[PDB]
Amino acid sequence: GPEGANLFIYHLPQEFGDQDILQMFMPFGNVISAKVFIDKQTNLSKCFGFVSYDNPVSAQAAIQAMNGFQIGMKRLKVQLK
């Protein structure tokens, strides 16, 4: 995740996994890695995670479009690392 190409995404539906956030974020550029952080004992998602582009412009673009975007019952908080 070269800087400033890295996002933290909070308020993510519990059901989302790595691939879901990756795909949700590809509209803004090539996502090169994505991880949803999971409680290791339950395997339930902790509802945030990490998106990493291959350039920072994509990351800004994504932040402006997605921060505050409502999906399900939650609104995503998306910020730069």
On the CB side of 15, CA atoms within 13 Å amount to 4
| Angle of CA points 74, 75, 80, to nearest 5° | 135
Experimental method, per PDB record = X-ray
Q: How far is CA 14 from the centre of its chain?
A: 13
Q: Resolution of the experimental model in angstroms, please?
A: 3.0
User: In 13-55, where does DSSP find H-type helix?
Assistant: 18-25
Angle between helices 56-66 and 18-25 (to 10 degrees): 100
Report the top-level CATH class of 1-81. Answer: alpha beta
